[PDB]
Design a protein around this ligand. Structure first.
Ligand SMILES: NC(=O)C1=CN([C@@H]2O[C@H](COP(=O)(O)OP(=O)(O)OC[C@H]3O[C@@H](n4cnc5c(N)ncnc54)[C@H](OP(=O)(O)O)[C@@H]3O)[C@@H](O)[C@H]2O)C=CC1
Lengths: 114, 340
């Protein structure tokens, strides 16, 4: 419950800072001031228009790489087993497969953008 | 004695001979009165009791040396003397919608007007433009309108040839009428006495009021006349607020609040030492229906045709819309029903 207390205190402190920020200063708002910033000129299109990702494949593969990182996390405890041969072979197998996937993506020009 | 021949083309660098002392120019109407005076090439003198920073927005309104800033004290006639000494026109716009610690409705709508009018006679000022309120009654439910009536008589006593203007409910970009209703969304619903079915209001555009004041100065017959500045349409309070929440694209939730409860709510918001969000007099004035005075000249007599609220309401309430309804035009919302 101590971690919950710490989280609550941090969140409350941050929200109190927000409250003081939004209620201490003298506020004078008008349409021009709150307009979006586009380096002094009016924006052409909406900022909510599609924004193409030139590294989409990199992200989709980062998904599986994060999966492999999740698979590799139990390794510090896995070294405490009596079957060190099998454990080591399986860990090196997972790492080799990760390297092979990275190599396949690299050679087939997947890490490149556009 | 201070008579100036106009020169130029009426532009920014011209001479108009309209040297004026606009009291309370640091306010909604003041900005427009100064800007109209400044663009013609008039020597505008701006007294101020606030921090020079708050007067900064008035600086670009006139050419070099055409906008003079000098401090004044409402309780010191000597400070009034040095600011109206060389002015051929004096305009009084000093007025607060809420009683302060050191200034009460009597002090701002009776004492100061009288002091300005009295001193102006001493200095020889030719024309004075006093700004009262359409619903100024000696027995009005609101102290604000009560003092606004007492001061009106005192100005005529101190300054017999003074033009008195009684605007209805000026609306504009920095207004406390259209923005007032649009800001009620934060409190959930829209509390209206009798659901706003027993109040008729005739708001006036800020530009029309300012141009009326300028035309009153230019007009040689406005001396001693009492004008009433009103809009071209009369609206029910419920219909007007619904239209306000219509062009603002906000969910309109009107619930009837009894008069005693609404007055109690107004008292709660008076506690704030800063500018109150609402006041008991503010509640009474809003609920009070606008008077009709067909025996007084209006904007039409001064050559300015009143602009309908429908045309100039999008400007005020566009900032109150969300991102979804920012780019919507001013024609999608249909005009509200007018009681004409
Ligand atoms: N819809 C409306 O607003 C209507 C208003 N009127 C009246 O016409 C005038 C229009 O002014 P408006 O645009 O509303 O002004 P604001 O309410 O926006 O600002 C008030 C102005 O008066 C000055 N002022 C107020 N009280 C004092 C004081 N005690 N001593 C010195 N200066 C003071 C302020 O100077 P500072 O900012 O430094 O305090 C400021 O320049 C007012 O007299 C108003 O009551 C009449 C009909 C309708």
């Amino acid at each position: 419950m101590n971690i919950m207390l710490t989280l609550l205190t941090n969140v409350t402190l941050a929200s109190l800072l927000v409250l003081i920020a939004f209620w201490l200063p003298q506020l004078n708002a008008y349409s021009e001031k709150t307009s979006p910033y586009e380096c002094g000129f009016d924006p052409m299109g909406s900022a909510r228009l599609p924004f193409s990702m030139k590294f989409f494949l990199v992200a989709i593969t980062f998904l599986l790489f994060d999966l492999e990182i999740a698979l590799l996390l139990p390794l510090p405890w896995a070294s405490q087993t009596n079957n060190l041969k099998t454990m080591l072979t399986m860990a090196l197998f997972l790492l080799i497969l990760l390297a092979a996937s990275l190599a396949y993506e690299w050679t087939q020009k997947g890490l490149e953008w556009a | 004695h201070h008579a100036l021949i106009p020169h130029g083309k009426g532009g920014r660098s011209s001479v108009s001979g309209i040297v004026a002392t606009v009291f309370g120019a640091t306010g909604f109407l003041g900005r427009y009165v100064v800007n109209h005076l400044g663009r013609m090439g008039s020597q505008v003198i701006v007294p101020y009791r606030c921090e020079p920073y708050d007067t900064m927005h008035l600086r670009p309104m006139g050419d070099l040396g055409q906008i003079i800033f000098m401090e004044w004290n409402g309780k010191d006639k000597d400070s009034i003397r040095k600011v109206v000494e060389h002015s051929n026109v004096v305009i009084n716009l000093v007025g607060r919608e809420w009683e302060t610690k050191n200034f009460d409705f009597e002090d701002v709508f009776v004492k100061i007007p009288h002091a300005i009018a009295q001193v102006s006679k001493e200095a020889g000022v030719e024309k004075l433009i006093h700004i009262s309120h359409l619903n100024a009654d000696i027995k009005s439910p609101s102290r604000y309108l009560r003092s606004k009536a007492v001061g009106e008589k005192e100005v005529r006593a101190a300054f017999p040839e003074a033009t008195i203007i009684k605007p209805s409910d000026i609306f504009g970009r920095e207004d406390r009428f259209l923005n007032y209703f649009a800001s009620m969304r934060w409190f959930g619903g829209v509390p209206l006495i009798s659901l706003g079915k027993e109040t008729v209001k005739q708001p006036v555009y800020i530009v029309d009021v300012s141009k009326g004041i300028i035309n009153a100065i230019k007009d040689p017959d406005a001396k001693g006349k009492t004008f009433a500045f009103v809009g071209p349409n009369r609206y029910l309070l419920f219909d007007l607020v619904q239209y306000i929440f219509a062009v603002a694209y906000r969910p309109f939730l009107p619930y009837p609040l009894p008069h005693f409860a609404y007055r109690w709510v107004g008292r709660l918001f008076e506690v704030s030492p800063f500018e109150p969000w609402t006041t008991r007099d503010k509640v009474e004035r809003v609920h009070m229906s606008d008077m009709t005075l067909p025996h007084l000249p209006g904007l039409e007599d001064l050559g300015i045709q009143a602009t309908p609220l429908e045309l100039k309401a999008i400007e005020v309430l566009r900032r109150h819309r969300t991102y979804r309804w920012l780019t919507s035009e001013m024609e999608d919302v249909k005009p509200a029903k007018t009681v004409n």
